[PDB]
Each structure stands twice: as C-alpha cells, then as structure tokens.
Amino acid sequence: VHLTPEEKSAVTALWGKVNVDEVGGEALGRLLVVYPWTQRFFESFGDLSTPDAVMGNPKVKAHGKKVLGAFSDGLAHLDNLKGTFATLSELHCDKLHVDPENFRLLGNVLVCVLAHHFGKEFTPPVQAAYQKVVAGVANALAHKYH
C-alpha cells in the first residue's frame, strides 16, 4: 500500500487522461465476458448473453462508472485504502458473497483496458505501478473476509 514517487508519478500521469464515463463500463463488461461466472451477481442487469449485448448494456456502463469512481477514490487515498473501502467490503463480502479472487480478476481486467486504450504509453513500469494499486484495492475490498 505504499507507492514510491516513481510509481505515484506513473499512476497519476495516466489517470488524469482516463475517460471516467467509459473505462469502468469497459472493464466491468470485459469481466462479464471473459469470466462468465461473474454474471451470477448481475442478473438484474438484463441481457448479458453475448459480448455485444454485455458491452452495449446500459446498466453495465452505468455501474462501471460507479466502480471506476471507487477506484478513483482509492487513488486519492492510497495511504488509507482499508478505510476507503470498508463500507464496500461489508457490501461485497457480507451481502453479495463475492469471492475475493474476483476482485483480483477485475483489477487485472482494468489493467488490460488501460493497456488497450493507451498503447505504448502503458509501459511495463507503468503497468507495475497500477498492479500495486489494484492489488491494494483488492486487499482492502477483501478485508471483511479476514
């Protein structure tokens, strides 16, 4: 949960460029397509029956914005990720029963989405900084299981 100045610079330089209206929906949609058991938690979202159905689904886009907003909040509070995600940890663990491995999977799908959008700019060191972040978010979201 501690980033060096190099890792902080990598994360912050890229994050200001992220389209917060789209990237969350892209990551959530790809999670649902690539790891189809995750659809079990989103039956209320409607048609998830094909990749095009998932990626065009308005509830997927809308929820993805909220998910990314929580990632952004975590980026603003790297030194206190457990306290930033405590309420969401209660929700996902006590109420939704999401296995915490899926937190890791969504973090890695987000990393893939960043790579897809930013290309050469998403260098191996930039990726490594983002992997520290998404691991920290996953661990904070899983805290209520511990």
């Binding site: 397509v33 990749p51 893939c112 989405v113 790579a115 959008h117 998403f122 990726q127």
Partner: protein, 137 residues
C-alpha cells in the same frame, strides 16, 4: 477451445508475426516488474531492462505460443517437452502461468488495439489458460 475461440486466437496471434521476440520479451518484463516473485525462477538470468537474455527467452516463449496456435487441437503433443520442462523439471507454480498469461494479454492489448475486442480477449484468455494447463500437467 471452441472453433470460434480458435478462429479468434488465430487472427489475433497472426498479427504478432516478426514481433514475436519483442512482444514475448515485453510480456516477460511486465511480469518480472509487476510480480517480482516470478523472478525466483530466473536467478540465472540478467533481468535488467534491455537484457539480451530476456530478449532471447521472450522469442522462445512467443514462438512456442505460435506453434501452439498452429496445433490448437492437440496442444498436449505440441507442448509435451515443454510440459516436462515446466511441470517436472522446473516445477513452475501454476499461479505464475496466470501472471504471465495476464502480462501477455496486456502486451497484446497495448500493441493490437483493433484486434483485442472483448470476444477476442476472452478467446485469448481461454487459449493461454489451456496452454497453462498443459504446461502444468
């Protein structure tokens, strides 16, 4: 792998071509930097940036994947010697195949945006997971 997965993997991986060494080396570097535990498998390598050893090994990993895509219906035979090497001789942790597979997907996403659709992403993930299953068996 479904025929659709095989079709998806073939066109996407076909785009790699002569970039095999570069992309394989890049995926390895992404793995070593993002997941430093994986470095314990390469004490005998120079892992610093621009390492010729990482470049040469990256080409072997990528070329082995190219052979696997060519034999996607009989990957146990196409990867058999490499399965012995990884599962029996080196004893590679299965977790590390998930880590390298993720870094390969990241590399393909960064270099082949148009090809890395959600459907192709899913097919490539399944392909790499199937390769990983053979290499850990």
């Amino acid at each position: 792998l479904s025929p659709a997965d095989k079709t998806n993997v073939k066109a996407a991986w076909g785009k790699v071509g002569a970039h095999a060494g570069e992309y394989g080396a890049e995926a390895l570097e992404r793995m070593f930097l993002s997941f430093p535990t994986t470095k314990t498998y390469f004490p005998h390598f120079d892992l610093s940036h621009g390492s010729a050893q990482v470049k040469g090994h990256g080409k072997k990993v990528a070329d082995a994947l190219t052979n696997a895509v060519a034999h996607v219906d009989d990957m146990p035979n196409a990867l058999s010697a490499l399965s012995d090497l990884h599962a029996h001789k080196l004893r590679v942790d299965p977790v590390n195949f998930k880590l390298l597979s993720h870094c390969l997907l990241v590399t393909l996403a960064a270099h082949l945006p148009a090809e890395f659709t959600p459907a192709v992403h899913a097919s490539l993930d399944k392909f790499l997971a199937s390769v990983s299953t053979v290499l850990t068996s």
